[model samples]
Every structure is written in C-alpha cells, then in structure tokens.
Target: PVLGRESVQVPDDQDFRSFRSECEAEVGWNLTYSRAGVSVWVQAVEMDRTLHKIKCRMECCDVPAETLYDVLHDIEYRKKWDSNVIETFDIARLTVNADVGYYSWRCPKPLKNRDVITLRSWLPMGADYIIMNYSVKHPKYPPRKDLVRAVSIQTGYLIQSTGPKSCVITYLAQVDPKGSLPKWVVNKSSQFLAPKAMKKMYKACLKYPEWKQKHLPHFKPWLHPEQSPLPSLALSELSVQHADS
Candidate 1:
C-alpha cells in the first residue's frame, strides 16, 4: 500500500550497495573536472532527446551529512545559494515520506525558464542518505505563461559519510528541457549546471546549521517526521541528536 501511495521506495541493502559501487566507478562517465576537493563526471547517452546522466562528487569537510540533508530538503533556502532556481515549494503531501512539489529554474539565454512538478521521496540508508524525485503532473500548479515546462525523468542526491564530520555528495539526474532547444546548448549547460550547483550547495550547507538555528519558525512542516509508529526510514539523522542539529 505504501508503494501504491507513493511511487518511491528506500532501496534495500543490496540496491544501496550497488548504487554506491556504481557511483565510485569511473569507467562509464566522462571526467569533466577534478579540482579543489571536487570531482565531476557525465555520461551522455544519445537518444531522440539527449540523456545527460551526471554524477558530481565533492567533499564537504565543514558540513556534516545532517546539515547537507537539511540543506537539500529546505526549499525556501534553495534560491539563496542556487541561482539557477527561480522558485520552489511543495504542492501537496502524498505521505510522510513522499510529496509533490514544484520547481522552476532559469535556463541560459535564448531559452525560456523551465519548471517541473515532481514527487520526491527520501529515506535514510544507514548513516548515509538518499533523496530521489521524478516528474509528475498536477492541475493546480500548471505551466505558467512566464515559464516553460521541463521534465526531470530522475533527479536525486546521495550523501555518503567519509568520516565523522565529513561526507561525499553525489548528484545524479536525467532531465529533458521540454522545449525547442538545441543539443549543443543543452550539452554545454549540462557541463556547467551540476558542478556549479554542487559547489553552491556545499557552500550553503556550511552555513545551514547556523541558519536553521536562527530560522526555526519558517521550517517546513512537511519535512518533519510523523510521531506515531515513528518511521524508521528517513533521510534525516541516525538519531535525535543529529536530527535536532
């Protein structure tokens, strides 16, 4: 019933292990840049529409996985660091673990701003974490005249702890800019977007702990865990100590 209710699941031990292995492998992806404690790669598969599957990993020594988790789920603070994002907010709660949301971002010049309605599901895999989202349709937040609709086939984050106070962040996504855009621009933008975004997030995550402490009133209600039965699966905290942080 949970599967039917929300079209996402926290992967089993085997799947999480498999995903971690694949992310560590460099054979499939093109190494675009590796510098200053960050590594970025992309593997492009040609189809009717180009599929740019990107993987960007970076070490955030100052930011812990808990703060990183908070930064990713905090949609209100997203635009502050991520300049590409025009605006973002949750549309509805599908369940405690999943929700529908909207996000719009600025495309490069000569292209329209793109938006998407998505279902995001997140869960904790040991001390690490995973948050995955896929495109969906909604009536209330339809495409606006000022924005172009975009499709995110799959978009997610994988945060793996490398040490007590450090972690490696990986971002993977398959996106389709649903408009008349050329391959060259898309490919070029692909090179810049993920890497740039990750860098921004890393910086913002460093500031998030202090920011969250100051701004508890504006905290998103949907991000909090349910009290009854207490879901074991969550993208936040291994325990209440980390969750409160």
Candidate 2:
C-alpha cells in the first residue's frame, strides 16, 4: 500500500510574496489568499485579466505530515483516484517538466464539453506545500500565442493538519470558465461543479490513507492535541525514525 495521490495545490509564499500590493486597489495582498481574495486564480481574461484563482486545504492525523504529503504527491496514483481525471499522461514519458506539461483529461462533460488536452501539475515534492498551474494547450492553439485566446488557467491549494485525535483537512478552490460559456452557466457551474469537486476530493482523501501508511508518519503528537501543535506548513513533515517499533 503506497501512500500517494496527486491533488491541485500551491506551494507556500516562502520568502517569496509575489503579490505585494500598496495602493488601495491593490490591497488585501496580506489576505490569506494571494491577496487576490481568491484561493485558485483561474479563468483569466488574458487580454483584460487572465487566469482564474483557486485554493485547497486539509489536515489529517494518526500519521505524520510527511506520510500524508508522500501520499498526496504520487502523480501515478492520481491517475486512479483524482476526481477530475479521466486519463492522465504518464509524467515520465514527457520531455517537459511534468509539473507544467500536457496531461490529457476527461472532465465532467459539462465543464470541458470535450476531453481536452490540458496542462496541469504542481511542485515542492518534499516541501510542506506546493504550487501548480493548469491551462489548455491544443496543438493548434498555443497559450497566449494564438488568437484562440487560452480557454482557462486556474489554480488551487491543499492544506492538512492534525486536530486533537482526528486529523483536520480543509480545501479551498476557485475557478472561472473560459470561452463563451453563458454567464448564467458560469454562475451555476461555480455553485454546482466546485462543490461537486470538493466532495470528490474529500471522498478521495479517505482512499489516500492506505498509500500514506506505506510511507509512515514522520511525526505524531502522542496525546493528539485539540489543535495541531505544529503550524500548518510544518505539519506535513514527520520523522518516522523516532517511531516506537
């Protein structure tokens, strides 16, 4: 039982706060989400404003953060359990950075309308948090290059930690459909699809435990505190070397 699964996430700002706003219009940069008031920034206009926003967060216990992290980073396993994936191209097979390359998909038809060739992935393999992007790139339609105007460029996050005895997990995401999707549809889809995807991932998480067990927890609070003794960023790392064999 290997602990590994892939989910959309972003790495911590980590001494790199890319979005530092000063003016009133540019305020909220200090807000939890990239100061954009958005968890995942997707569905950008490109010309006017491109890239939608999204975020994901969650916490789990009875295991170390590393164990949880390892399970979440396994791209291979993502092919099986990821909610939005119908089929994912093998990362090793691609010449480009798998973290930002072409991955085929079969989204809920209402979303994509067709199985599109989408670019999606994340980085920070060993780090507590990771950053990622997903955009459309057809052989005929290049990104920000062709007039076809990219369909969508969205983002998301994943946060996890231990709460008392049980683990606490939180996921935050945002998306803006691209192209000429009806505004009404966008509104409805946001309300419908996002929640649907959220439930899918929560359900998907229960499946990740077996994979995590194989990696073993790097750290675990003995008494399971009412809240995560460690900070969110530091929680995903456990030192199994101290485990009671």
Candidate 3:
C-alpha cells in the first residue's frame, strides 16, 4: 500500500484539532446503540435519506493505546479484515504523517458499490492521538467502472488512553452516499453499522500488534518523523516488506 502525492501543503495541525473539537462538542445527538462498552450516537441531517453525522465511542480496557493506534493506521491489514472492501491501495504520500489513497467497497446487496479518494493524516499529541481524513481528488484514481464514487465530508478517530493498557476510541464520520437509500439501509444504519464496525475494529486492534510483529515488524508507517530513521522528506515507496492481503 505504498502512496504519495506530487506537491501540496499538507493540512495544518490546527485543522485536525479543530475538527476533533467539533466532534467532541456535538451535543443533542440521539443515542442509537449502547452495549458492551460501546455507544453509538447520531445527529440526523436528512432523515429520509439516512444521511447523518455519526459518532461511535468504545472503551478498550484491554488494548494498549499505542497498539490500537497502530492497528487503525495499517492500511494493508485493513483491506484483509474489513468485509466491505472490494479493492484498495495507497495512491500517494503527502508527508510522513499524511497520505492519499483509494478504497472501493461493496455496500449490502441491492446497493451499488462505492469508492473514495481521500487525504488521510494523523498525529500523536503527547499520549492522545488523532487520525482524520476528508475526500480528495487524485489524477491517477478516477471513478472506476463498477463503483459509484462516494464522497466523504469528514471522517476521524480520536484515541485517548485512560490508563496503562486502557484506551477509548471516538469515531466520527459524515458521508454523502451520492445516491438513493432504501429502508433497510435506514434501519441498519440506525443500529448495526457503526457498532458492528467498532466491534470488528476492536478485535483487529487486539490482534494487530502480534500479527505485525510476526509478519511485517519494520513496516512502520505509523512512526513519527523523529521516531525512525526514515526521514519524513524521503522520496520513497512503502518497502517491499508490506504483507500481501
């Protein structure tokens, strides 16, 4: 999943902070699901179409904060574990902490598959961390023949450690499907999607560290600029060490 872009100033750090703050400040959101230490909440924008601003928070008491962060940022592994993915690859890198990539996914049957080009960026601020992405166009990746190109208004995760080997994940996303929605989608979106996705994610985070250690140990794209010998400005592709999905 090697990726990069030609020439663009990566979004500033303050932008991410601002987005994260907005996610946190959202109130009056209706609770959609609460169980197993996870809570799903949403604020409807267009009720009939089921398009909404979503937030799902989970308490991960058993997983270490840094380990969870690494799992979420691993793109290749994501392709394997995410059931919705049809195809994905890194399109380009903006900097050490930022990248542009393409992902196409199958929605539940009767709904068209969708694809997106996104500029994803991440930063670790002390013990807290944030990863955020917004839709971006790339010259190399256009709407494919079989997939409806979907647009993401915003998407992000905020990971906070409660204690050693304890963490909380706050996921916020707002997306436009670019097409019609059925009643099933509305019902399922009301309950299943976010919580189910969170459970799958938590399971992956629990298993990812050992998997990376056993397989691609040095394939550390999550490492910060000063954290590794790989300089941020180095013109390169992800090493051949990436595990094939």
Candidate 4:
C-alpha cells in the first residue's frame, strides 16, 4: 500500500523523533529575520532551486504550550485571526489522529489565489504537539481555474514547552506555491511573510483562551478524537499530489 493511502498512519514515535530533529537542524539555514523573540530562516532545497524551505521559531513568553496547541488545532477559531484564509474545513477523518481537509487562501494582488487538499496528521507528545500535512488529490476536489493549486511537500508546527506558561513554537514548511512568478519575488515574499505570520499567530495565541471560553472551549478533536464529528474515509480514495500536477 502507498504510505498515505489504503490507511493513513498516525505519525509514530520514530516519525516524531525525526521531525523534531529536522526542525532543530541548523546547518544550512540562513537567518532571515530575528526580533522580539521570533526568528525566521530559509534554506534552498536541493531538488528545486525555486522551492525553498522555511523555518520560524517564536518564543511565547506568557502563553502556555497547551494553549498554543489548541489555537493551532481550533479550526473554527482560525477565521477570526487568519486574515489570509478564504475557506478551510475538514473533509474526512482517516483515523483518530489523521484527517483530510480543504484549504483556500487569498494571495497578494497580481497573483492568483491558492488552494490545496491535504492529508493532515497530528501527534501529542506530553506537553509538545506536532501537526503536519502534505498535498493529496481527492476525486471530489480538483484544481480550480481561478486559484493556483499549491503543493505542500511537508508543512507543520512543533510546539515545545519551556516553562509553565512558556513555549517555543516552530513552523516549518517545504511548499511549492505553484505559479510562474519570478524566483526573487518568491524568496523575498517568503522571508517577509514568515515573520508577519509568526507575529499574527503569537497575538492570536494570547487571545485564544478568552475567545475559546465562549466557543465550545472543550471541543478539541485533535486532542480527543472521540469528539470529532467528521465522517471517516478510506485512504485509498486519495493519491499523492505532486508539484507538477
């Protein structure tokens, strides 16, 4: 069976171990931005010069690790903070720890909007949480002409606790933002975009607890799968999506 098909595997211990190590790797990354306890780095991928990997670390001084994790997992709450989002919703659950979803977001003017279908998986390691996704093709959701269909080779977050009310959050992705734009444009935008997004997320994290109180505070399906209402799906229904697709 294909790795992401037939049955999606909930990332195991080894998966988490390697992912954490990858996030911590610093050999080739160039520091693009660093200020206010948030740092962003970029590295060129060997497979494609136009495609680069981004890694951002944000130090949450007063926010608990759990709150940050909840903020990232809370889909409904996202619309309030993520201004770039056009539409995002869960499509189906492959397992208690894995699901598939559709996400479309607005791109800057002069560029077409973008969208994707991804197979997302999550893992909770004590106080740390890892959520990841990659592009996948679903029969029902084909690429739209109005929006570019981007590919997420790998994209996710790693939240690690530092103290009772502090954590270090890292966002990493090797995505192909599919378009014919110039290379310099993509590189410059990503460098600037990472920090802006990091700051936005930090502010969102600070406000999440209060906002959550009024909106189903206890309904976190990522942490407690039994609470999810999404329909189950066979992994065989999905196929890996490539950048060229």
- The deviation in Å at residue 239 for candidate 2 is 41
Which runs of model 4 end up more than 4 angstroms from their true locations? Answer: 1-12, 44-48
| lDDT of every predicted structure (CA atoms) | 0.69, 0.35, 0.72, 0.82
lDDT of 3 at 160: 89
Ranking by lDDT: 4, 3, 1, 2
**Which of candidates 3 and 4 is the stronger one according to TM-score?**
4
How many clashes does the backbone of model 3 have?
Answer: 5
For each candidate in turn, the TM-score is 0.78, 0.46, 0.81, 0.91
Q: Where is model 2 more than 4 Å wrong at Cα? A: 1-16, 19-64, 90-98, 103-112, 115-127, 136-152, 158-180, 209-245
Could you give candidate 3's per-residue lDDT for residues 107-187 as a string of tens digits?
877778998877778888789889887676665576676777776667789998888999998998766666466534654
Question: What is the TM-score of candidate 3?
Answer: 0.81
Candidate 4 pairs with clashing backbones:
none
Q: In candidate 3, list every pair of residues with a backbone clash.
A: 3-92, 3-93, 4-92, 4-93, 5-93
Deviation of model 3 at 120, angstroms: 0.5
Report the number of the highest-TM-score candidate.
4
Q: TM-score ranking from best to worst?
A: 4, 3, 1, 2
Please write out the lDDT profile of model 4 over residues 218-242, one tens digit for every residue: 8888878888999988877877786
lDDT-better candidate, 2 vs 3: 3
Q: Taking the tens digit of each residue's C-alpha lDDT, what string does model 2 give over 1-245?
A: 00013322232343112211111112222222232112222222323233223332333444444444444455455665665554444222121222223343443544442232333333332333332334433343233321123223333333333443333333333334444565455544453455445445545566666654554443322212232232222112211110011
Give the RMSD in angstroms, all C-alphas superposed, for model 2: 14.4
